Amino acid sequence: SAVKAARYGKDNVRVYKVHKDEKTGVQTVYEMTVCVLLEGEIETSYTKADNSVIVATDSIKNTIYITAKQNPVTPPELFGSILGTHFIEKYNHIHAAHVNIVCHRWTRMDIDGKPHPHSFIRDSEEKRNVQVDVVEGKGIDIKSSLSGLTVLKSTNSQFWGFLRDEYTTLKETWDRILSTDVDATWQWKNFSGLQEVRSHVPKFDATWATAREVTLKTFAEDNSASVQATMYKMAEQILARQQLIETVEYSLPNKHYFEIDLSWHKGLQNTGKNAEVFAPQSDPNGLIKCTVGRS
Amino acid sequence: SAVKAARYGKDNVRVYKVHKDEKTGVQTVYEMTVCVLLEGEIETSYTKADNSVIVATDSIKNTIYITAKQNPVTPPELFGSILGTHFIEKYNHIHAAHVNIVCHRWTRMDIDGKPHPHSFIRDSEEKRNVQVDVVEGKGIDIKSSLSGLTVLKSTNSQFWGFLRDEYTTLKETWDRILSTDVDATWQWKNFSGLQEVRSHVPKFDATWATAREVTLKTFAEDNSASVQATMYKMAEQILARQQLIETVEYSLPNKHYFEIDLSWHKGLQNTGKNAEVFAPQSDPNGLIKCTVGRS
Amino acid sequence: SAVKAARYGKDNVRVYKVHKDEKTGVQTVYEMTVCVLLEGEIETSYTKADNSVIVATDSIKNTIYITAKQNPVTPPELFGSILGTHFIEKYNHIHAAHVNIVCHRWTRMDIDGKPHPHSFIRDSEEKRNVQVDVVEGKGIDIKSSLSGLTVLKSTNSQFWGFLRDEYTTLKETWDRILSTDVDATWQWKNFSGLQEVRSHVPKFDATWATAREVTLKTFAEDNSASVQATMYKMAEQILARQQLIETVEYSLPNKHYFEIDLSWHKGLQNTGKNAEVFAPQSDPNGLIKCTVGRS
Amino acid sequence: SAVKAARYGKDNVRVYKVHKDEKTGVQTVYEMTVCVLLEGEIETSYTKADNSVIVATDSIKNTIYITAKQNPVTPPELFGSILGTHFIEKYNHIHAAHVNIVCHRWTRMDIDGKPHPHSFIRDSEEKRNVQVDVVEGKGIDIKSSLSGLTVLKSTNSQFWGFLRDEYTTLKETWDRILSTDVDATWQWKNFSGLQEVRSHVPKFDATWATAREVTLKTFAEDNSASVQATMYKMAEQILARQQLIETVEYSLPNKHYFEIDLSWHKGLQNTGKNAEVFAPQSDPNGLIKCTVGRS
Ligand code: NA
Ligand code: NA
Ligand code: NA
Ligand code: NA
């Protein structure tokens, strides 16, 4: 046998960082979960019990905290690039570092209509994520995303005109509920290294904001012909607004809300135009994906 | 042997309801998860395979949907009282109905600074709950709560002066992070039946709002001596602002954020006043509870 | 306002212990999650920021580990009684200790038909639990349980003869799938203190084994008239076999498996006696409970 | 813009199937969760609201149940190949089907030492999985796996000799706990179509059994130099025992169990050779991966 691929490191590293403005008293907090996986000339740790090539995963953990102490942790695209670059430069035999960061929300509280200097609320489990691949000789590849954005519209979704054959029982509809959990990813042009990532730092938060804005507005305003058609509209606009993005990926479940026929009970009318009470379905769910790039 | 207690019913009943304003086009959605458990003269279903006393749990499910079709589902205190009252009045041998409702957030979206008529976002997993116990001959007992409200303050928490003996290693501190997931419950005076619950309908949403407001403001503004002292302040104010509440209960985890000593690395200073990077601890956690009532 | 009830402590304390037999080389492992909550003359920590009455929850944590170091952690009824007794005896102002223990499975591996001296597998998420309430002047109250025991029978469950009215749509059946997750609790006679708990130590593992055995055999062999009737049979036998148990509680979900009518497709017959493919339902679910005691 | 990739279908489809032996009364049950995602000439559903190219995901659901009714659901490699082949043959414009199946355990109960004909227990959350990619013109690519296999050894794990620099604090050890959740995948040689998959049907269950056996025995018997070295041993043996496998992948977390220094308390000795009580760490965790193929 032979090792064909190998990577190893530390997962689920929870990190908090606070910034304290000494002049204003305003504090700002950041919280993330980090994974770093290394690749390189490490195959002998697998085949020959040669631990000399292993940067201990506990040391990877230490390095995450030390890097957060010495560097900004925002935007996460930059933090991840700094972290990944560290491993490939520090260790001659480590040739790639794969950095995944999940950013958790801590939104400043408004108390009596005024922003509080040190109190925060988690307004949802929506995450902002990055996957940063730092590869010696091949620059830095960054995928940015939002996930866990849960939305519902109560009308202005339709689904008709689909293929009908002997496997088909679904009725066409011209008015249904549409609910999903948005997973949206934008893939940046390859960067040649940390300097180039730094040169674009303002674009990371601005593109996250654009993606979020475009997602919500397109979902709210498109009288949707299908999940497929709505998500493509989202992706085309994000590409039109940031030319340093090469592709946009969406992965969207269709979380079904079924009508409930109550006509067996006292002739109760609860379908079609009279539909008021629905049964949300936990499973199964449609799953719709696409990757859109530039023509 | 003998049956000492017995209750049965349907759990995890997901329910959605939409209201459509025909004049304005504005739609409003509600989503909940409901459990109804019945008690009564049902012991022979257990001891003698006498299913004649069983209102099938599938029929309990049907009844939840039918009740939601015919009645408002908000505030949940009212919906639960209507539902529970139905079972004890409909069925001579059913003497208590226990109704648990978890309300899920669907907050109207703001698109370009304007509220959207039919699009909603789940801004957090925070829940609004009720437990309604409808007992023949004993009225309706309602416990209202909020849960899953996750908060953090980055300073203005302290913990010193606690008992110190041979089991103690914790250092006193005058400045620490405090983070918790708030579970707060207010217990109403017994209501004599559905009419009395209806007579107080506006107080249910207003008291939920007060509890939420008081929780957030007290957490943000109290320079906390302990979780115990902060939560008692919250409970006293809620009791002062709604005299139809008899008790307030809080259950608060202390989700620890540990300092990380980095001085072993190049003399890095990351403790005490220099503490910037912390390690959030998934477990264990302090757990602090109290029930406060009127003197 | 006034404090009506208060308890506090440390939750989610994960504990592992190993026993090493020096002569045979055989090692045995135990893993649990522990919660200890204390009550007593602690109200001033809530009302007057008097932390002097607080045994720090970090010290409660230390005490759990120290107690596990110095004492057997099996059976958990004993460990919990030792732990709870410690707090009420050590601290004059602490008058009750509430100890919850969840025991995780580590079953010795069989390698080539022979038991391995130090290798273990988690054969399921089934738990063995205890709730031990140590109350000064009132002895030690122990509730023992098993939970997470997931079972299915593919026939020899029936459900007919239930109440039928205008809310009823369920069809009677004489042959259905029955699947549940068993939560079974046995409540011991009050013990006067640790000596009495110690005097009964062999009965704790033996009664857990009986409960488990009786549950599985009754589920497998009863041609069930209803969940209610089957669970009552289980509880009566456990009471008959351990006279130091005062009550037995079961809480059983009915995890439904729905038939799928495929006759719309090429006249496929998949219902009734031809039922082969089913759709397991994640929600809703029946929930059936009872507490059985001695006549 | 342009669609670069697109796939869509139905996820989280829960399926149960029973086989009833008419002669012996013995019933056997199977339960899985299925995802089917289709690719093909479907881009106009995204770009032009052309739903005519969409095989509705509800119809994909129907097709899963119909296929389970008409075909064996075991081994899952075969079921998945039948299912995927159906879509690419039935629909001219569908050119790939991606089938993921998670198989849930239902192990026959032993009641009084004898196998029960229709009663089953879920002995763990360990899963058996397949990923089957049916691609027109390119055959059928199958990845088989086991996941969720949770194990612990209490000694005969070591970790020393690793790189030590200014980021390193971990102490070398010659005796530690090793615990992991095994995710192991074996990748079959490409099959030219369903006939070739059928020709190998006995090898699917036998190779799953070998992988499981080899994993457990290697974990139990290797005095492990590192997770890397132990997992490579597992993968080499599986490749040696099934020549129709091209690669083996392992993904193994190192779930840490930390020693607890109790010497601050009455000189208690709980480290090194005296280590008896440990604190299992929920996070972070090492994560070690490798893909092994043939030299
Ligand atoms: Na390098
Ligand atoms: Na009644
Ligand atoms: Na005491
Ligand atoms: Na095709």
Contacts of B162 in chain C (CB under 8 A): 51-52, 54-56
3-state secondary structure of A271: coil
Distances (CA, A) of A287 to A150, A181, A257, D58: 14, 10, 15, 11
3-state secondary structure of D292: strand
CA–CA gap between residue B22 and residue B135 (Å, rounded): 39
Unique residue bearing structure tokens 């995204």: D46
Cβ–Cβ below 8 Å for D149 and C121: yes
- Whether D256 is a known active-site residue: answer yes
Cβ–Cβ below 8 Å for A287 and D160: no
Tokens standing for residue A39: 């690749």
The domains of chain B are located at 1-295
Task: Please give the residue of chain B at the shortest CA–CA distance from A263.
Answer: B66
Please tell me whether C108 is known to bind a ligand. no
Cα angle value B17/B18/B23 (rounded, 5°) = 155
Please tell me whether A58 is known to bind a ligand. yes
Experimental method: X-ray
CA–CA gap between residue B215 and residue B238 (Å, rounded): 9
3-state secondary structure of C179: strand
Which of A58, A94, A169 would best serve as a mutation to test chain D binding (most D beta carbons within 10 A)? A58
CA–CA gap between residue A89 and residue A94 (Å, rounded): 8
Strands B139-153 and A114-121: antiparallel
Please tell me whether D34 is known to bind a ligand. no
Please name which of B288, B294, B216 lies closest in space to residue C45, comparing C-alpha atoms.
B288
Please tell me whether C198 is known to bind a ligand. no
The beta strand positions in chain A, using DSSP E, are 2-20, 27-40, 94-104, 107-111, 114-121, 127-135, 139-153, 178-188, 245-254, 257-259, 277-280, 285-293
Query: In angstroms, what separates the C-alpha of C202 from chain B's closest C-alpha?
Result: 25
Tokens standing for residue D61: 């659901």
Amino acid at B276: E
Helix axes A57-70, A76-90, angle to 10 degrees: 130
Helix (H) or strand (E) holding A233: helix A227-241
CA–CA gap between residue D57 and residue D61 (Å, rounded): 6
Query: In angstroms, what separates the C-alpha of D50 from chain A's closest C-alpha?
Result: 8
Furthest-apart CA pair in chain C: how many Å?
A: 78
- Tell how far the Cα of B1 is from the centroid of ligand 2, in angstroms: 26
Please name which of D27, D134, D20 lies closest in space to residue D77, comparing C-alpha atoms.
D134
Tokens standing for residue B43: 């012991």
Task: Please give the residue of chain D at the shortest CA–CA distance from B266.
Answer: D166
Query: In angstroms, what separates the C-alpha of A112 from chain D's closest C-alpha?
Result: 38
Fold entry, domain D1-295: Urate Oxidase (3.10.270)
Please name which of D202, D211, D60 lies closest in space to residue D147, comparing C-alpha atoms.
D211
Cβ–Cβ below 8 Å for C150 and D122: yes
Which of D170, D283, D285 would best serve as a mutation to test chain B binding (most B beta carbons within 10 A)? D283
- Tell how far the Cα of C33 is from the centroid of ligand 3, in angstroms: 24
Task: Return the number of other C-beta atoms located less than 10 Å from residue D217's C-beta.
Answer: 17
Tokens standing for residue C161: 């003869």
Unique residue bearing structure tokens 């090692």: C27
Please name which of C66, C44, C64, C65 lies closest in space to residue C54, comparing C-alpha atoms.
C44
3-state secondary structure of C276: coil
Strands C114-121 and C107-111: antiparallel
For the annotated catalytic residues of C, the residue numbers are: 10, 57, 256
Contacts of B185 in chain C (CB under 8 A): none
Ligand with minimal distance to B42 CA:
2
Cβ–Cβ below 8 Å for A232 and D58: no
Contacts of C260 in chain A (CB under 8 A): none
Unique residue bearing structure tokens 């059936």: C288
Pick from B16, B116, B276: which is nearest to A18 by CB?
B276
Helix axes B201-221, B76-90, angle to 10 degrees: 140
Tokens standing for residue C135: 């109350």
Q: Where does residue A266 fall: left (phi above 0), alpha (psi -120 to 50 degrees), or beta otherwise?
A: left
CA–CA gap between residue B288 and residue C6 (Å, rounded): 8
Please name which of D104, D71, D77, D123 lies closest in space to residue D242, comparing C-alpha atoms.
D77
Distances (CA, A) of B245 to B143, B185, B189, B242: 9, 10, 6, 6
3-state secondary structure of D202: helix
Contacts of D10 in chain A (CB under 8 A): 284-287
Ligand with minimal distance to D136 CA:
4
What is the per-residue DSSP string for B191-251?
BSSHHHHHHTHHHHHHHHHHHHHHHHHHHHH--BS-HHHHHHHHHHHHHHH-TTEEEEEEE
Tokens standing for residue B245: 């509440």
Ligand with minimal distance to B85 CA:
2
Helix axes C201-221, C76-90, angle to 10 degrees: 140
Please tell me whether A176 is known to bind a ligand. yes
Tokens standing for residue B105: 């957030």
The beta strand positions in chain D, using DSSP E, are 2-20, 27-40, 94-104, 107-111, 114-121, 127-135, 139-153, 178-188, 245-254, 257-259, 277-280, 285-293
Cβ–Cβ below 8 Å for C35 and B287: yes
CA–CA gap between residue C256 and residue C227 (Å, rounded): 12
Query: How far does Cα C18 stand from its chain's mean position?
Result: 23
Task: Return the number of other C-beta atoms located less than 10 Å from residue D10's C-beta.
Answer: 25
Query: In angstroms, what separates the C-alpha of B266 from chain A's closest C-alpha?
Result: 10
- Cβ-contact D146, D127 below 8 angstroms: yes
Helix (H) or strand (E) holding C233: helix C227-241
Sign of CA dihedral A271, A275, A277, A282: positive
Bridge partners of residue D178, in order along the sequence = D153
Tokens standing for residue A7: 């990577």
* Total length of chain D: 295
Pick from B116, B220, B268: which is nearest to A109 by CB?
B220
Distances (CA, A) of A168 to A228, B168, D61, D189: 19, 68, 10, 35
Cβ–Cβ below 8 Å for D277 and C65: yes
- Cβ-contact A174, A159 below 8 angstroms: no
CA–CA gap between residue D244 and residue D187 (Å, rounded): 9
CA–CA gap between residue B223 and residue B228 (Å, rounded): 13
Instruction: Provide the annotated binding site of B.
Output: 57-58, 159, 176, 227-228, 254
Ligand with minimal distance to B39 CA:
2
Pick from A152, A216, A260: which is nearest to B29 by CB?
A152
Contacts across the C-D interface (CB distance below 8 Å)? 161
Which of C11, C12, C17, C18 would best serve as a mutation to test chain D binding (most D beta carbons within 10 A)? C18
- Tell how far the Cα of A89 is from the centroid of ligand 1, in angstroms: 5
CA–CA gap between residue D105 and residue D110 (Å, rounded): 15
- Cβ-contact A144, A129 below 8 angstroms: yes
3-state secondary structure of C280: strand
- Cβ-contact A166, C266 below 8 angstroms: yes
Contacts of B29 in chain A (CB under 8 A): 152, 154
Task: Please give the residue of chain C at the shortest CA–CA distance from D125.
Answer: C124
3-state secondary structure of C34: strand
3-state secondary structure of C42: coil
CA–CA gap between residue D186 and residue D208 (Å, rounded): 9
Q: To 10 degrees, the CA torsion angle through B175, B176, B182, B183?
A: -90
Cβ–Cβ below 8 Å for D266 and B166: yes
